[model samples]
Structures are given as structure tokens and as C-alpha cells.
Target: MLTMKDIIRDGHPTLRQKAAELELPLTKEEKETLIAMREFLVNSQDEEIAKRYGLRSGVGLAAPQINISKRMIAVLIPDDGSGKSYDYMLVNPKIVSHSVQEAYLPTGEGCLSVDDNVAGLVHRHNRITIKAKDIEGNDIQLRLKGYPAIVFQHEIDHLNGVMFYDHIDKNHPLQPHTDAVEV
Candidate 1:
């Protein structure tokens, strides 16, 4: 299981570097790493386990966050609106298309790598279509919207050496985009 200690903080060189794609048919060690990431995400979201382990609540995590510059990410999100949830462990993800409409988190976005408070709106596409692969190298396609879309974009940005704060306006960090829908 990975803890906050395993996650590198902001200003780390790895977070700013483009991650390399994993070769087809992941190695045993690579698969284990993905499993560990999933475990960390699951345990972090559990109230009792999180409190006991001092873990931060996160819906998604990327390899670069743990100092592994690979194009892989894990996501476990609970869909409170539908009383359901889904998990995704994606490798070499690519956004094929996105909606013209824009969205933003009204309360702002937070990052595990960034310890300091950052005030800003990180506008994202309201919907997106992505093409990726599973740990087994099986092709996977998704058309995501709302919260899920936002989460996917955030993780994919890590692979491209981009941070959530990078999308915020420097001079008007707190200024919300009137054109974007608040998710």
C-alpha cells in the first residue's frame, strides 16, 4: 500500500517531465504497482482506514505522483448521484475528442502533490472521449462526462507534465469563467 510518504510533493522534477508509455504486456512488477495504486486509492477513501493511516482522500492517482514517470493512472470514484461508482486503471491514455462546452469545479481543485493551498479555477471540458488500454494491454474506450470527465483530465494532465494549477489564470486565479458549467 502507498501512503502520502510515497507521493512526491510539488516542485519535484518527475512531476514536470513527460511520462513514457509502458510497453505492451506489462511486466509482473508493473502490474503489481498498478494493484498497489488501486489499493492506496481504495484505502484512502475508506473513512476508518484513511484516518488510521493518515491518508488523503483522492479519487485518482498517476504513476508520476509516486516518482514513476510512466503513462499510467488509477481512478476509483463513487458516483454519489447514482448510488454507484466505477474504477479504472488506464495506461497510455489519449483524449480523442472533447465537448465544446466547458466546466469547472466550483470549490476549486486540489492535488495530493501540492501541499500548499492554491486558489483558482481549473476549467475543463464538460465531456471527453478517451482511448486507452488496460494493464493486460487490452484496448479500452470511454466517453466520460461530468465529474468523471474532470477526474480523467486531471490524471491525464500528469502524464503530459501538466498540473491542474497550470490551467488557472495567473492574474485572476480566483476568477471563474462565466462560460463554464460548474460541476
Candidate 2:
């Protein structure tokens, strides 16, 4: 019963407003959505559906990217094993701390909401500590490193109405790409 209308993208009104306060520790609907989204993202066995939810190009997807007003984030950094075995969702999450040192890389970036227009160089933290709840109301903390960490920071920022554009140097188009990944 999972469908693809769940992901919202940039410039949408909901992305402008702060995500709705999570009905946490989680409501039944929220939990259901969590699992649905996870299944939709991880093992849908349907490439088109998966890509529709942004399973195509990146390691993570946000609810707001699909236009959902609720708080949900799914991530899957490539793992060594085959069959795309690693994927998960974090609901009602918060980034409680970050390392002072951030690294930037020029990885290609795109969004479920933005099409045919990829930006260049988005800055993100190379390491971070995040506190989040799962669909079942379990509290979990994630220590993210490298690309995954940077992505977590980016998507969480989306939930809070922050975009990668915020950190870009609008005044200096000539600014050298400083470890920033363009997503």
C-alpha cells in the first residue's frame, strides 16, 4: 500500500515552515509512515518507485522532499554487501552536536523536488551526533562520519527549513569550491 507522494522538495511551502512537531514519541500514522517509507526506500523492488522517492541518486531522502509535512528521514550509504541491504529511517530526529571541523567535497547533488538543475558545492559537517526516534519509539543516537554525516546534516536542515543555499557564498561566484559537495 505504499505510494510515492511522500517526498517533497525545495521551494515548497511546507519546506518553508518548520516541520510539524512530531507526534512523538510517534502516533500510529507516523509509525506506519515510517515503516512504509523505509520499505518504500529500501526494498520496494521497484526501481521507478524507489527513484521516485529519491532512491535513485543519493543515500538519503527527506519527507519534506516529497512534500510530506511530517518529520521523517531515510538514509542508505552504500554498504559492502550486495542487494542494497542497508537502509533505514529516522523519525523525529535532532542533531544535538557537531564537530567543529567540517570537510567539503564536490559530490554531485540533486533533489526529489528539483529537477534538471543541480547546484555546485554544498557545504556540510563531516562528522555529527544525531538523536532520533525510530518508528517504534526507540531513542537512538547516530555518529555519522564522512559523506553520511554530511548528508544527515543536510537533510535535517531541510526539516528545519534550512537549505544548502543558505551556506553558499552569494556574493562571490568566483569562490573556489571548498570541499563542498554540490547537491
State the displacement of the C-alpha of residue 31, model 1, in Å, after optimal TM-score superposition: 0.6
Q: What are the per-residue Cα lDDT tens digits for candidate 1 across 61-180? A: 999999999999999997768976869898999999999888889888999999987888889999999999998999999999888899999999999999999998999987877778
> On a 0 to 100 scale, what is the lDDT of residue 122 in model 1?
89
- Clashes per candidate (backbone, < 3 Å): 0, 13
Candidate 1 weakest ten by summed lDDT: 78-87
Model 2 C-alpha lDDT per residue in residues 87-123, reported as the tens digit of each score: 5688878988887665554543555555455455555
Evaluate all candidate structures by whole-model CA lDDT and list the values in order. Answer: 0.92, 0.66
TM-score of each: 0.97, 0.77
Error of 2 at 91 (Å): 1.9
